[PDB]
């Protein structure tokens, strides 16, 4: 080791004093053939690790290398110079030298080269810089590297694409402006194309990471969806790579709220229902979330999910989930969506009961459940109540007194001269709406009136919010068909507000009001 140390020390001196300063002068020559030949020598020297320090520790040399690469018209020269900079980019010292020498803007310019060797040296060197040189990200952006990188996504070398996409991820993360530039360059379509074209796992992985970063952008999101992003990411949900599956899921979830109008979602929906049964908590959480958004106001999606056994799968997810609200809220929201406004809605309402889900569903209304989950669960119970067969079991699970409790608390909390992201006014409408439907049953009506709810329901007739006025009038309409209830409602002084509601632009409100009035007069 002492021999090599001595020999290297001597050679380093010869380089720093003779070779390097000489080659720098030749790179600056007017004769391009001299520059070319000199560039070759510099490149050959860069291949030997021990010779690199002599090269990088000379700002004049580095600057000459960069300037030559960026200005040359000789392919071989561009190749040698880029290759040299790459050889010097393996450590902090070299990276800093390339950076200070203005290598970034030159390396970015090389991204416009038609020669693979140059592009490969350029992208890997920029990647090294992007990974370790502070200030590299801003310089690459300023030099317009994003635009050049996106334009290169049409290339076919999968290893090259993997590095190129990763540079985009590094440059785009947490930088809204970089995401818009990528969008403006047509990044979404180009990224989606890769996902449905290549099988190279490392590329799919790096590409899925860029899509995830862009999926939280309100501009890129719809672009990704329109480009077929959902279907494309769905293609890899069963791929052996867990990191890929999870990145595809996170991305799909972020995009999900803007994909409710997409067609060709059959395969995706079917796979998500299957994933609901995964042992992986992060997978189940994303599957539930994506399904909730995809079933939202899309009867076709609701129909497909039910047809692949989505009701049974979601109930099972809720049953084994316990207190994990990250899973229960979206799963319950999905069940809520599936139990209303579609051809199989009625069948889904019964299926929840037939799959032994009623007890756990009513249980979620109680502590430690938080407002988001409670609101969703009240919505689901409201839909389940549409099914006569669910009238008795729901009452037997104590749903009525719990709904009344939530209603009282939510309403009193609205008194004044957002709780856990939920407005108490939403809970008031929701619980009263659920009670209105459950009140279609005679035994339930008795339970409801026995909880002394009439004074509250009458008070709700005065609410500024007409949606609340509607459900209050409605539940009173159901209860009023009972003599004692009708008289009690009258005693509460409900005649005045109900008469006023007769003029309501809302037909439902007007009809319910009249119904209650007729019942009282009789």
């Amino acid at each position: 080791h002492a021999v090599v140390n001595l020999i290297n020390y001597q050679d380093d001196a010869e380089l720093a004093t003779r070779a390097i300063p000489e080659l720098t002068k030749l790179l600056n020559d007017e004769d391009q053939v001299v520059v070319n030949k000199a560039a070759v020598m510099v490149h050959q020297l860069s291949k030997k690790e021990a010779s690199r320090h002599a090269i990088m520790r000379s700002p004049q040399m580095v600057s000459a290398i960069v300037r030559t690469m960026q200005n040359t018209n000789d392919v071989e020269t561009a190749r040698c110079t880029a290759g040299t900079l790459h050889n010097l980019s393996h450590h902090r010292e070299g990276l800093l030298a390339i950076f200070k020498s203005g290598g970034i803007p030159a390396l970015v310019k090389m991204l416009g080269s038609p020669v693979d060797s140059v592009l490969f040296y350029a992208i890997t060197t920029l990647h090294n810089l992007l990974l370790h040189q502070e200030g590299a990200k801003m310089a690459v952006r300023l030099a317009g590297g994003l635009q050049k990188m996106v334009a290169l996504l049409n290339k076919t070398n999968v290893k090259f694409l993997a590095i190129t996409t990763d540079c985009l991820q590094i440059l785009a993360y947490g930088n809204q402006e970089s995401k818009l530039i990528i969008l403006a360059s047509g990044g979404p379509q180009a990224l989606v194309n890769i996902m449905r074209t290549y099988t190279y796992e490392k590329l799919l992985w790096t590409t899925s990471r860029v899509l995830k970063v862009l999926s939280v952008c309100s501009s890129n999101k719809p672009a990704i969806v329109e480009a077929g992003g959902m279907q494309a990411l769905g293609l890899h949900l069963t791929d052996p790579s867990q990191r890929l599956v999870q990145n595809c899921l996170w991305t799909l979830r972020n995009l999900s709220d803007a994909a409710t109008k997409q067609e060709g979602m059959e395969g995706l929906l079917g796979t998500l229902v299957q994933l609901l049964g995964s042992d992986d908590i992060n997978v189940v959480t994303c599957a539930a979330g994506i399904l909730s958004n995809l079933t939202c106001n899309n009867y076709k999606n609701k129909m497909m999910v039910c047809q692949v056994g989505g009701i049974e799968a979601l109930v099972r997810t809720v049953l084994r989930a316990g207190d994990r609200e990250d899973i229960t809220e979206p799963a319950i929201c999905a069940l809520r969506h599936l139990t209303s406004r579609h051809q199989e809605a009625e069948m889904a309402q019964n299926a929840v009961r037939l799959h032994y889900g009623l007890p756990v569903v009513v249980k979620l209304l109680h502590p430690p459940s938080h407002w988001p989950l409670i609101k969703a669960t009240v919505g689901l119970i409201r839909n389940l109540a549409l099914c006569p067969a669910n009238h008795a079991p729901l009452r037997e699970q104590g749903a009525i007194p719990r709904l009344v409790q939530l209603l009282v608390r939510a309403h009193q909390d609205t008194q004044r001269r957002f709780v856990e992201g939920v407005r108490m006014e939403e809970i008031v409408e929701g619980c009263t709406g659920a009670l209105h439907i459950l009140a279609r049953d005679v035994h339930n009506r008795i339970v409801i009136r026995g909880l002394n709810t009439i004074p509250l329901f009458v008070q709700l007739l005065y609410s500024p919010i007409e949606n609340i006025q509607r459900v209050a009038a409605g539940v009173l309409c159901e209860l009023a068909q009972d003599k004692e209830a009708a008289e009690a409602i009258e005693a509460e002084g409900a005649t005045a507000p109900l008469t006023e509601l007769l003029h309501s632009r809302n037909e439902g409100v007007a009809t319910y009001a009249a119904a209650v009035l007729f019942r009282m007069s009789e």
């Binding site: 060797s117 490969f120 979830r253 972020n254 939403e426």
Partner: protein, 41 residues
């Protein structure tokens, strides 16, 4: 006034979107991919 969100009617509760927007975590192994790419030109 109308309800800003939620609500429903005789056909049930109104469906609602859950706004997911998790970018989270930028790991701040392509090493072999890089050397492999350059080790041919």
């Amino acid at each position: 006034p109308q309800l800003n969100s939620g609500g429903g009617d005789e056909l049930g509760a109104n469906d609602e979107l859950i706004r997911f927007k998790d970018e989270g975590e930028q790991e701040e192994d392509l090493a072999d991919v890089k050397s492999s790419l350059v080790n041919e030109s």
